[PDB]
Amino acid sequence: GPEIMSKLAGESESNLRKAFEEAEKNAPAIIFIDELDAIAPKREKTHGEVERRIVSQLLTLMDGLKQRAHVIVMAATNRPNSIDPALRRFGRFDREVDIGIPDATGRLEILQIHTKNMKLADDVDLEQVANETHGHVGADLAALCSEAALQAIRKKMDLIDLEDETIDAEVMNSLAVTMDDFRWALSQSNPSALRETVVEVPQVTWEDIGGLEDVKRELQELVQYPVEHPDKFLKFGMTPSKGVLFYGPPGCGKTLLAKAIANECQANFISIKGPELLTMWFGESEANVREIFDKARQAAPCVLFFDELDSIAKARGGNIGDGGGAADRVINQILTEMDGMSTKKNVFIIGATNRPDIIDPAILRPGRLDQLIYIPLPDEKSRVAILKANLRKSPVAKDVDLEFLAKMTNGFSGADLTEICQRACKLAIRESIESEIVPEIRRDHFEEAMRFARRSVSDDDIDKYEDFADTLQ
Amino acid sequence: NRPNRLIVDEAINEDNSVVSLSQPKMDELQLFRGDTVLLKGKKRREAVCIVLSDDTCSDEKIRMNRVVRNNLRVRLGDVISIQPCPDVKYGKRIHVLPIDDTVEGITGNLFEVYLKPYFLEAYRPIRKGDIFLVRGGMRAVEFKVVETDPSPYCIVAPDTVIHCEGEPIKREDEEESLNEVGYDDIGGCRKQLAQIKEMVELPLRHPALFKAIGVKPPRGILLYGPPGTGKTLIARAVANETGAFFFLINGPEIMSKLAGESESNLRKAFEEAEKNAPAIIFIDELDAIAPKREKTHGEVERRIVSQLLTLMDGLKQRAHVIVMAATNRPNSIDPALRRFGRFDREVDIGIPDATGRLEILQIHTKNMKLADDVDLEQVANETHGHVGADLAALCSEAALQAIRKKMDLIDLEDETIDAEVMNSLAVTMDDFRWALSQSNPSALRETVVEVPQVTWEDIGGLEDVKRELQELVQYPVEHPDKFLKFGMTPSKGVLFYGPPGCGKTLLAKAIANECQANFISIKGPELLTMWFGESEANVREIFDKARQAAPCVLFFDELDSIAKARGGNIGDGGGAADRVINQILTEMDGMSTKKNVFIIGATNRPDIIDPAILRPGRLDQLIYIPLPDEKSRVAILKANLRKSPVAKDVDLEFLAKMTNGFSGADLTEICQRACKLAIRESIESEIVPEIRRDHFEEAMRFARRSVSDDDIDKYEDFADTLQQSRGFGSFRFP
């Protein structure tokens, strides 16, 4: 990109002329433009005649492809809206590929590529590192491994110091990198990688949520069927539901369910948090809603999840607030992109809320969020799987009974149970530190943590949701 | 592998004739507490110094300043061989002469000013061919030893004939000037230099290392910070300490060239840098070259920007060149230069903190003769928003003020001023007060990221929270593996709540002082400023500056200030969420779980705080802070009167057991009015003064309590609602 924009006015078009012409002779070939955004940002940064002339020069060269000459032009940029829309015309750049950050599985594949030459120890679990790298791109993993290697290096030959133009191989071949060396690299300021909206496949199954077999098949009828049996839908003639709204008390696994169902379908997941919606609301930027759907469509099959949908309505008072309407600019735009979206695609929308009594009924109308599903507090069997899930990454003993707490906790939620486990860990870790100046989280930790256990969901809150569910039928 | 071969590291004792080692290493070499050693180094040079045990030193490293280091012709990261030299006797005739580039202006008796007070019962051992630096006459003058009678090395005796020809000798090529900028010339960048040096240590000292390994060395280092600390001096010092080539690219310098000569300079700068690897090309004002965004009017400007971009990709890696650059703000540079492949690494170097400001003041007073009554730390305190440049000029006006008191009333018309006058010249502490009373110390006030100098001793009692606090900041950073074992994640923040004047701010600072981390004070007005101007986009900017200062304690003092402006009490019909608070929650959840920054939020109105902030994963732990008890108000009164002339019959505990519903704020107000009455007595009687007991007894005739009984009982009800228990049971099977 900048290579061409560095050349003076005149040699710019010359380089483009020579590029396509000489590459066309070597057909088949692939012409790759690097920083295309630096070439055609034809909007407000198009200050001058030369730039527009350069863009048009490229535009003409794009059209100049005689087809019989077999060359294909590829390009790259930071984001779709960086390039001049005139290049988006179907006849030039017709095919588009979204290459976002890698997921857990993605980064693991990359780590194997960057560690294929270095001697990884037995304790080193590269897959573990991939899971706790929340927002890292391919390049960041390179600098991650590099800075971690230096940690393992500045402890060996550094004391010996072999001032030579060539280091001996025998000394280096014996060298190995430990798990702690990878830890130190993460500890530095280099993992500060760009964080965007992460679109990945949920690594959580139904086994993390106990029981509730009715809602499993319920969700499957809504997403599994129109993708695994599309021929069957054409046989009966019906059109698949476009979305579902989750309502109930907070911390009952509404988010986890939405992920779990996406895991069953092996589809992509997008988590649009409450604050993200309000950011558009306060900033008067409901336009970004459109961008989400397009980003979700380019990851089909995908589940678009709006956690805490009521968050906007909550800002407008909720109970009373203003005298005015039930709809706002942000929620309205979601409705627009929902109806506009093709029914026979594969993108599904799930809306979670802890206040269904203030959600605009316009969203619950047929052809949008048709189904209304109530998610209550986890039952007797449910609490069993929840506790096991929350203690999957903890040195729990075998004398510790989990079903016992499931018979202990009744009016408790998934969030409350997690809070209990974490409170036990504070006492568990405090013990290990105090001992030094041996430690595995045991029974008495939980039984001492239960004294600081609360039931966040009040009985009156339960009754309101039962009341609301009564009106529905 | 011979334990006599040690690595040269930075020194702690800035004296010339002294080397520092670790005591256990001294136990291996059978050395004593003050033996004349012999240091051999590269290019066959010897230097004789004295050994002193430095407990903060490692076993493999040896401490020595730049003066000795350059005599050995070695850089930081080299190995030198040390052997004891006890055959050193007292000297007779010592031939010594100064260098011409350090006496270029002054004359007279250099011995009386520099030499004599430098060997006044010092017994310093000097070898023939050594260069020692003596700071006096408000400058730096170097001397090279010509010939000593007990050649080559000897100890200077009080009965030693000091020959001085009086001829300023020249400096040789290999003799690097000590007058240049090194790591002993920059301060207020302790955390910064560490990050910087460890990024440029290996790739500049051992090019063969990175070419024989798969590790990718950095190509670009960006330096933020406001114009003052000396980003220019940092990169320059690195090149003169590591020995790398130094070619600076001044912004306006290149942009002042013709329509075409601008490219010529950059093309040549990188060329003459690539040819002289290892090299450091330091683009001074980067924003003056590539501010591509809205101020990109014209093709000529972008023709320069896109040129530098290719000159970065043009770095062939095989050649060793690191491009450093300075800027006033990270968002003044074209995002194409923000690409993690050109200027991938970035270091935020904000304003100097309280500790850092004094560190700088020490550098700008090493040449001048300060009086005994002068305390430089005092000046470092009353400068809340100063940078390195302003601290540098602060001494300039203060020093010249002392100059406008001595020979200024005598006046000697000479083209050169005598050194005897400059040696008897001193600067009073009052002269610095004049420098502060002037309009000159006023510097640019930005976000102060400091390491709190306030300890727990200022906050008496309340040990229940100290233990709870350390579990949230001390534990997860000093015991990382412990969190890994049990697989739990640290709470990202904590909300304080209770009556004002109970040291919420004082706690969040003290807890940072314990961890020895950084601290950011985002006060109320700094939160409303974004709300009125609708600039809630600056919230992300804070977390970023907080992130690039890890470990850091992000502190939102008076978080309810925004809820207060919306009404809080009555307020409009709107919800609990505002734009600024919302954006704080965005960056909070959008922060990596295993980062470092801890988010403490302080409020005195917990009933109007958005419950979304107190959700699990944000501000989970609720810490109530009551008024100081009887055993708390004791040490607190000690704190507010720590810097005040205490008397004998002033029973402080008598006030503690007397006071009850008084907050820390109410205690200080009593002390303030106590001192005013004391000064009142002094000034009027002078037309001897020490504050007495009846000044306090008279202060309790108009003293009032801030917090009311209704307020206290109200906060208790807020706590009784939160922490409690259902508790359990009440279970059913169906």
Short mmCIF file of C-alpha atoms in Angstrom, two decimals, chain A residues 2-3 5-9 34-35 37-38 41 45 47-51 77-78 114 132 134 139-140 142 145-147 149-150 153-154 157-161 163-167 172 183-184 186 188-195 250 274-276 278-279 281-284 308 314-318 320-322 354 380 383 393-395 406-412 419 422-423 425-426 428-430 432-434 436 439-441 450-455 459, chain B residues 1 5 7 42 60 77-79 195 198-199 202 206 208-210 212-216 218 263 292-294 296-299 302-307 309-310 313 334-336 339-340 342 345-346 467-468 471-472 475 479-480 482-489 534 536 540 547-548 550 566 573-579 582-583 585-586 589-596 612 615-616 618 620-621 720-734:
data_model
loop_
_atom_site.label_atom_id
_atom_site.label_comp_id
_atom_site.label_asym_id
_atom_site.label_seq_id
_atom_site.Cartn_x
_atom_site.Cartn_y
_atom_site.Cartn_z
CA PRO A 2 2.30 2.78 1.27
CA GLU A 3 4.90 1.60 -1.27
CA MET A 5 1.62 6.11 -2.14
CA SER A 6 5.28 6.87 -1.43
CA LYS A 7 6.14 7.11 -5.12
CA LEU A 8 5.67 10.56 -6.66
CA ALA A 9 2.56 11.57 -8.61
CA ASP A 34 -1.30 -5.01 1.02
CA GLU A 35 -2.58 -1.88 2.77
CA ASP A 37 -6.97 1.30 2.80
CA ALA A 38 -3.94 3.55 2.28
CA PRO A 41 -10.03 5.75 1.36
CA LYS A 45 -9.32 11.80 3.42
CA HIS A 47 -8.13 15.68 -0.18
CA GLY A 48 -6.62 16.28 -3.61
CA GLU A 49 -6.85 15.20 -7.25
CA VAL A 50 -3.92 12.77 -7.31
CA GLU A 51 -5.50 10.35 -4.82
CA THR A 77 -7.43 -4.04 4.97
CA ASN A 78 -8.26 -3.34 8.62
CA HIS A 114 5.28 -21.14 16.35
CA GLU A 132 -6.70 -17.84 28.43
CA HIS A 134 -8.93 -13.79 25.37
CA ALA A 139 1.15 -11.88 15.23
CA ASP A 140 0.76 -11.49 19.00
CA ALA A 142 4.72 -14.81 17.72
CA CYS A 145 6.64 -17.12 22.20
CA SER A 146 9.64 -14.92 21.43
CA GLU A 147 9.59 -12.96 24.70
CA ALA A 149 12.06 -17.80 24.97
CA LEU A 150 14.20 -14.87 26.10
CA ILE A 153 17.58 -17.85 27.62
CA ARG A 154 18.55 -15.15 30.13
CA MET A 157 24.30 -19.15 28.73
CA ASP A 158 23.74 -15.55 29.86
CA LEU A 159 25.93 -16.25 32.90
CA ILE A 160 28.49 -17.99 30.69
CA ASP A 161 28.42 -15.36 27.93
CA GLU A 163 30.89 -13.63 22.74
CA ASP A 164 30.99 -15.18 19.27
CA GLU A 165 29.54 -14.68 15.80
CA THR A 166 28.17 -18.22 16.03
CA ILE A 167 26.67 -19.89 19.11
CA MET A 172 21.18 -24.75 22.66
CA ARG A 183 3.79 -17.21 32.16
CA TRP A 184 6.37 -14.41 32.32
CA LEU A 186 1.99 -12.97 29.53
CA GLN A 188 4.72 -8.36 30.45
CA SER A 189 3.01 -5.51 28.56
CA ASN A 190 3.24 -7.28 25.19
CA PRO A 191 0.03 -9.33 25.37
CA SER A 192 -1.79 -5.98 25.06
CA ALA A 193 -3.46 -7.01 21.80
CA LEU A 194 -6.48 -5.38 20.16
CA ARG A 195 -9.81 -6.58 21.54
CA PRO A 250 -30.56 -13.28 36.84
CA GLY A 274 -25.78 -4.57 27.77
CA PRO A 275 -23.22 -1.73 28.05
CA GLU A 276 -22.54 -2.19 24.33
CA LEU A 278 -26.21 1.59 25.85
CA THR A 279 -23.00 2.85 24.25
CA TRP A 281 -27.92 4.64 22.89
CA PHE A 282 -25.99 7.39 24.68
CA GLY A 283 -23.76 7.98 21.66
CA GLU A 284 -26.79 8.21 19.37
CA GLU A 308 -29.78 -7.92 28.97
CA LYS A 314 -33.93 0.31 32.18
CA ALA A 315 -32.09 3.55 31.40
CA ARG A 316 -35.39 5.25 30.53
CA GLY A 317 -36.70 4.55 34.03
CA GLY A 318 -38.35 1.21 33.33
CA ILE A 320 -42.26 4.93 35.05
CA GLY A 321 -39.50 7.02 33.50
CA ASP A 322 -40.80 9.05 30.59
CA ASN A 354 -34.27 -10.19 33.74
CA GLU A 380 -32.38 -30.42 42.36
CA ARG A 383 -27.46 -27.80 40.92
CA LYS A 393 -10.81 -26.26 37.37
CA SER A 394 -10.33 -26.73 41.11
CA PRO A 395 -8.43 -29.34 43.19
CA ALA A 406 -27.65 -29.62 45.73
CA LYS A 407 -29.94 -30.96 48.45
CA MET A 408 -28.77 -28.09 50.64
CA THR A 409 -29.33 -25.19 48.26
CA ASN A 410 -32.91 -24.68 47.06
CA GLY A 411 -33.76 -21.06 46.30
CA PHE A 412 -30.27 -20.55 44.90
CA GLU A 419 -20.08 -17.14 44.30
CA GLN A 422 -15.06 -18.64 44.84
CA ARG A 423 -15.46 -17.60 48.49
CA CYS A 425 -11.11 -20.51 47.22
CA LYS A 426 -10.19 -17.24 48.94
CA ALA A 428 -8.16 -22.00 50.41
CA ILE A 429 -5.45 -19.80 48.87
CA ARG A 430 -5.03 -17.74 52.05
CA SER A 432 -1.38 -21.93 51.34
CA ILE A 433 0.29 -18.54 51.71
CA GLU A 434 0.03 -18.51 55.51
CA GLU A 436 4.83 -21.16 53.99
CA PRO A 439 -2.85 -27.11 49.91
CA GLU A 440 -5.89 -28.63 48.19
CA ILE A 441 -9.37 -27.09 48.48
CA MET A 450 -21.80 -21.26 53.22
CA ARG A 451 -22.14 -18.77 56.07
CA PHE A 452 -21.52 -16.04 53.50
CA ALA A 453 -24.01 -17.51 51.03
CA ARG A 454 -27.06 -15.57 49.86
CA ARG A 455 -30.25 -16.28 47.92
CA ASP A 459 -39.70 -15.26 46.60
CA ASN B 1 34.54 -20.68 35.52
CA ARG B 5 35.10 -12.53 36.26
CA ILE B 7 29.51 -8.45 34.90
CA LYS B 42 38.92 -4.58 27.48
CA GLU B 60 27.37 -12.12 39.36
CA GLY B 77 26.80 -6.23 30.01
CA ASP B 78 30.53 -6.83 29.74
CA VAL B 79 32.77 -9.07 31.85
CA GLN B 195 11.05 -1.89 30.11
CA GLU B 198 15.24 -4.98 28.53
CA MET B 199 13.89 -4.41 25.02
CA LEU B 202 20.17 -8.22 24.02
CA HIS B 206 24.46 -9.49 20.98
CA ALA B 208 24.48 -12.97 16.93
CA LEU B 209 21.93 -14.10 19.52
CA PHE B 210 18.78 -13.10 17.63
CA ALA B 212 20.90 -17.74 15.72
CA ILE B 213 17.48 -17.97 17.37
CA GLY B 214 13.85 -17.70 16.25
CA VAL B 215 13.13 -14.81 18.61
CA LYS B 216 12.00 -11.68 16.76
CA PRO B 218 11.60 -5.18 18.14
CA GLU B 263 12.48 12.29 1.34
CA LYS B 292 -2.42 11.44 9.02
CA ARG B 293 -6.07 11.73 10.04
CA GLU B 294 -7.85 15.06 9.57
CA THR B 296 -3.77 15.48 6.14
CA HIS B 297 -4.55 18.26 3.66
CA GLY B 298 -2.41 17.78 0.56
CA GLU B 299 -0.66 14.98 -1.31
CA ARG B 302 0.97 11.93 2.71
CA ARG B 303 3.87 11.53 0.29
CA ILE B 304 6.11 11.88 3.34
CA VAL B 305 3.97 9.71 5.62
CA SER B 306 3.74 6.77 3.21
CA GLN B 307 7.49 7.14 2.63
CA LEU B 309 5.98 3.65 6.37
CA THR B 310 7.99 1.91 3.65
CA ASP B 313 9.12 -2.17 6.23
CA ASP B 334 -1.00 7.81 11.80
CA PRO B 335 -2.61 4.44 12.74
CA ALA B 336 -0.51 2.90 9.95
CA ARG B 339 0.77 -1.27 13.16
CA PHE B 340 2.23 -4.04 15.31
CA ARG B 342 6.57 -1.16 12.65
CA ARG B 345 6.16 -1.63 21.22
CA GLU B 346 4.92 1.44 23.09
CA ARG B 467 -6.13 -8.06 55.63
CA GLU B 468 -9.07 -8.11 53.22
CA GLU B 471 -6.05 -10.60 49.56
CA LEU B 472 -7.17 -8.63 46.51
CA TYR B 475 -1.86 -11.92 47.01
CA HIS B 479 1.42 -15.40 44.58
CA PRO B 480 0.40 -15.95 40.93
CA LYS B 482 -1.56 -19.87 44.07
CA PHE B 483 -4.39 -18.51 41.93
CA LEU B 484 -3.43 -20.96 39.18
CA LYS B 485 -3.60 -23.96 41.52
CA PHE B 486 -7.12 -23.42 42.82
CA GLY B 487 -8.27 -22.06 39.47
CA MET B 488 -10.02 -18.95 40.75
CA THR B 489 -10.08 -15.50 39.15
CA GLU B 534 -20.35 14.31 26.70
CA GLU B 536 -17.26 9.66 27.86
CA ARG B 540 -11.17 3.95 27.60
CA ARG B 547 -2.93 -0.65 31.91
CA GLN B 548 0.36 0.81 30.68
CA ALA B 550 0.85 -2.04 35.74
CA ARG B 566 -28.63 13.78 37.76
CA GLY B 573 -37.41 9.78 35.79
CA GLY B 574 -34.34 8.35 34.08
CA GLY B 575 -32.71 5.07 35.06
CA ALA B 576 -29.60 4.50 37.15
CA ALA B 577 -27.28 4.32 34.15
CA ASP B 578 -25.44 7.32 32.68
CA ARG B 579 -23.06 7.50 29.71
CA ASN B 582 -21.65 2.85 31.39
CA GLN B 583 -18.34 3.26 29.57
CA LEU B 585 -18.35 -0.91 32.83
CA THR B 586 -17.45 -1.47 29.18
CA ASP B 589 -15.55 -6.26 31.45
CA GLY B 590 -13.44 -5.66 28.35
CA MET B 591 -10.28 -6.02 30.41
CA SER B 592 -8.31 -9.27 30.56
CA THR B 593 -9.01 -11.28 33.72
CA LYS B 594 -5.33 -11.87 34.45
CA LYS B 595 -4.10 -8.31 33.87
CA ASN B 596 -3.02 -6.27 36.89
CA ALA B 612 -24.77 -2.91 37.62
CA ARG B 615 -22.31 -7.10 39.83
CA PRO B 616 -20.06 -10.18 40.17
CA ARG B 618 -16.79 -5.88 38.45
CA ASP B 620 -17.86 -7.58 43.83
CA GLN B 621 -16.54 -6.92 47.33
CA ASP B 720 -27.42 -4.94 57.33
CA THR B 721 -29.38 -5.37 54.09
CA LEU B 722 -26.37 -6.60 52.12
CA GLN B 723 -24.30 -8.94 54.29
CA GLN B 724 -26.42 -11.42 56.25
CA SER B 725 -28.01 -14.80 55.53
CA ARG B 726 -31.36 -16.35 54.64
CA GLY B 727 -29.68 -18.54 55.72
CA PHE B 728 -30.11 -22.03 54.31
CA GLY B 729 -32.40 -25.05 54.50
CA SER B 730 -36.01 -24.77 53.32
CA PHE B 731 -35.55 -27.56 50.79
CA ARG B 732 -38.11 -29.57 48.82
CA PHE B 733 -37.83 -32.63 46.56
CA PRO B 734 -40.54 -32.47 43.84
#
